[PDB]
Design a protein around this ligand. Structure first.
Ligand SMILES: [K+]
Ligand SMILES: [K+]
Ligand SMILES: [K+]
Ligand SMILES: [K+]
Ligand SMILES: [K+]
Ligand SMILES: [K+]
Ligand SMILES: [Mg+2]
Ligand SMILES: [Mg+2]
Ligand SMILES: [Mg+2]
Ligand SMILES: [Mg+2]
Ligand SMILES: [Mg+2]
Ligand SMILES: [Mg+2]
Ligand SMILES: [Mg+2]
Ligand SMILES: [Mg+2]
Ligand SMILES: [Mg+2]
Ligand SMILES: [Mg+2]
Ligand SMILES: [Mg+2]
Ligand SMILES: [Mg+2]
Ligand SMILES: [Mg+2]
Ligand SMILES: [Mg+2]
Ligand SMILES: [Mg+2]
Ligand SMILES: [Mg+2]
Ligand SMILES: [Mg+2]
Ligand SMILES: [Mg+2]
Ligand SMILES: [Mg+2]
Ligand SMILES: [Mg+2]
Ligand SMILES: [Mg+2]
Ligand SMILES: [Mg+2]
Ligand SMILES: [Mg+2]
Ligand SMILES: [Mg+2]
Ligand SMILES: [Mg+2]
Ligand SMILES: [Mg+2]
Ligand SMILES: [Mg+2]
Ligand SMILES: [Mg+2]
Ligand SMILES: [Mg+2]
Ligand SMILES: [Mg+2]
Ligand SMILES: [Mg+2]
Ligand SMILES: [Mg+2]
Ligand SMILES: [Mg+2]
Ligand SMILES: [Mg+2]
Lengths: 119, 73, 88, 101
RNA sequence: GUGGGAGAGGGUGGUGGAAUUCCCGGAGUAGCGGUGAAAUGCGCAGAUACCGGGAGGAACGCCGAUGGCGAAGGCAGCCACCUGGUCCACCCGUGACGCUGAGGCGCGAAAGCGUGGGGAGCAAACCGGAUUAGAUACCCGGGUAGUCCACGCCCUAAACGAUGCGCGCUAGGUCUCUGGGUCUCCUGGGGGCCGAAGCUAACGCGUUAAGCGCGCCGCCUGGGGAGUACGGCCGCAAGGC
């Protein structure tokens, strides 16, 4: 209880899970969901379907606060990242606008061995 | 294929060395605050090279962006 | 660096005659200027090895001339040296 | 002696009184080092492409002074001392390289 | 000499924004993370995800190019100072002053050594989780030296074009970087490709020769034993020649 009816819907996709955080017009989180918050536990969290449920769960949890419209912020290139958008669109919540804001360094820290090579 | 118009042809005489003309410099950045390629800027290697330098100056001054958020998607 | 004025002074101060720009003396003179300007530079920036390469190349170009000058007119030689204050 | 361009960004919240003092302190040091203001362009303020010092705007100055190189760096560093001075960008003046003309 | 030019060539100081980590505040709640699948691990002392602030170290996205500079190693944010090389035009000066270069001397990626400093991220060793017939490995969670700075050592390498330096001579086509011009195009320097003659065992090379020639240096002489042993010289050591 706090009533907002307009805020941010941050999607955090990765090759291992998707996770949505909904906030107020100032960035403070109201509710969130993820592949784990829903039943999935292993690699199923990174599933595009997982993303869907996770997104929808958060939409509902936010609807409960009077949330009606929200701006979307995409981050990462995980699977089921578009499915997370898609969901938020059909989640009753009005999707005011999508914006990909994934961070990318201008080259700073040496990546883990798993992430090395370029060009 | 880098179609559409060229950022240069679509402009008049300008000082590729003036790091303060935020209006014309701005024209060479992408939707993101990224510096466009020769394929798009329609500049010469020598010119493009001078741009990069000036643009970088305007960014440090505060006159130009280092990176912007991608709208729509 | 070294301005036209500086450059010009030494040139004149050494030309064997009016208009003499490329005589063995003029060169040796001019070269000495660089070497000295560069030598001072290296005392400060000791890690600027790259520039040092130039140095060796000048010092060696100078040797070539003086070595020549001395073989042709051992006088203008002892002269050019004395003025510039070189040798050992 | 070489021609340089002394760019300076100031606090966008200085009152006519404050602005004036800071702005003169600038003139001051310029002398104390060897500047010879050839022309100014107090463009005032504009909307920064990103927040500098937490502000979305900045008060931009400018001068096309001439001075003794050996000081340039030494001078600029001085200008930065002030708290309302958030940017000091000096550049060896150049011949405008035209283009698409 | 004079007048012009391009450049991540070198040294010094200063400085900018993105990101990671950490700490502070807010908001918020049950997981996060990771994989083929997992577990270790981290989280109700409240993590992950989100917003604001602060600190710090290291590296410089787009520009970026088959691009440029350097003798090689190698060199990329921006600004200033200090400094090397080099190219073009004018035909002005000297008047063969040239080329090469045993020994010497200087430089010389990485790792490594000494002393002091720094330490975000990464990560030999090492500590764990998996995997497997085993798994002193690959994958996963951690993590020390080190990776960074100053100063001094070390002197190696697939230090490669696996192609020593200079000079003259012998079709072109084409793209490109950088000068000069009466600016299709001409002329000079550099970077690519294909290819005349020619060369080459073949592959290929071919005005950036591996062609035709001259000068000088270095090197080779079947494989293994062996880059070993001995001697010497060098190095704090590792070890180098
Ligand atoms: K032009
Ligand atoms: K658990
Ligand atoms: K130079
Ligand atoms: K140690
Ligand atoms: K053939
Ligand atoms: K021995
Ligand atoms: Mg000249
Ligand atoms: Mg450089
Ligand atoms: Mg917190
Ligand atoms: Mg709390
Ligand atoms: Mg536990
Ligand atoms: Mg509790
Ligand atoms: Mg975190
Ligand atoms: Mg710290
Ligand atoms: Mg080369
Ligand atoms: Mg190389
Ligand atoms: Mg003549
Ligand atoms: Mg004569
Ligand atoms: Mg030699
Ligand atoms: Mg070394
Ligand atoms: Mg090292
Ligand atoms: Mg050490
Ligand atoms: Mg130490
Ligand atoms: Mg690690
Ligand atoms: Mg086992
Ligand atoms: Mg590991
Ligand atoms: Mg060192
Ligand atoms: Mg190679
Ligand atoms: Mg060709
Ligand atoms: Mg050519
Ligand atoms: Mg050419
Ligand atoms: Mg090349
Ligand atoms: Mg060929
Ligand atoms: Mg043939
Ligand atoms: Mg030849
Ligand atoms: Mg041998
Ligand atoms: Mg044998
Ligand atoms: Mg035998
Ligand atoms: Mg043998
Ligand atoms: Mg050995």
């Amino acid at each position: 209880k706090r009533q907002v009816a307009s805020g941010r819907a941050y999607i955090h996709a990765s090759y291992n899970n998707t996770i949505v955080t909904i906030t107020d017009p100032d960035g403070n989180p109201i509710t969130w969901s993820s592949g784990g918050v829903i039943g999935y536990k292993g690699s199923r969290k990174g599933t595009p379907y997982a993303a869907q449920l996770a997104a929808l769960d958060a939409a509902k949890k936010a609807m409960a606060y009077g949330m009606q419209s929200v701006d979307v912020i995409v981050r990462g290139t995980g699977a089921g990242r578009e499915q997370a958008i898609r969901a938020l669109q059909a989640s009753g919540l009005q999707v005011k606008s999508i914006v990909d804001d994934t961070p990318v360094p201008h080259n700073g820290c040496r990546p883990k061995k798993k992430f090395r090579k370029a060009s | 294929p880098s179609r559409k118009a060229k950022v240069k042809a679509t402009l008049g005489e300008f000082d590729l060395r003036d790091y303060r003309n935020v209006e014309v410099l701005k024209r060479f950045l992408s939707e993101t605050g990224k510096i466009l390629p020769r394929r798009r800027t329609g500049l010469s290697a020598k010119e493009q090279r001078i741009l990069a330098k000036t643009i970088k100056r305007a960014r440090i001054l505060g006159l130009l962006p280092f990176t912007e958020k991608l709208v729509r998607k | 660096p070294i301005t036209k004025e500086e450059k010009q002074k030494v040139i004149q101060e050494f030309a064997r005659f009016p208009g003499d720009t490329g005589s063995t003396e003029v060169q040796v003179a001019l070269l000495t200027l660089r070497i000295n300007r560069l030598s001072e530079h290296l005392k400060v920036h000791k890690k600027d090895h790259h520039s040092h390469r130039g140095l060796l190349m000048m010092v060696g170009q100078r040797r070539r001339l003086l070595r020549y000058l001395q073989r042709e007119d051992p006088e203008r030689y002892r002269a050019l040296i004395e003025k510039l204050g070189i040798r050992g | 002696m070489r021609r340089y361009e002394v760019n300076i960004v100031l606090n966008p919240n200085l009152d006519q009184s404050q602005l004036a003092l800071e702005k003169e302190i600038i003139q001051r040091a310029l002398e104390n080092y060897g500047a010879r203001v050839e022309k100014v362009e107090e463009l005032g303020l504009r909307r920064l492409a990103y927040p500098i010092a937490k502000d979305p705007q900045g008060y931009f100055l400018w001068y096309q002074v001439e001075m003794p190189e050996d000081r340039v760096n030494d001078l600029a560093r001085e200008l930065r001392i002030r708290d309302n001075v958030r940017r000091v960008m000096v550049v060896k003046s150049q011949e405008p390289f035209l283009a698409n003309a």
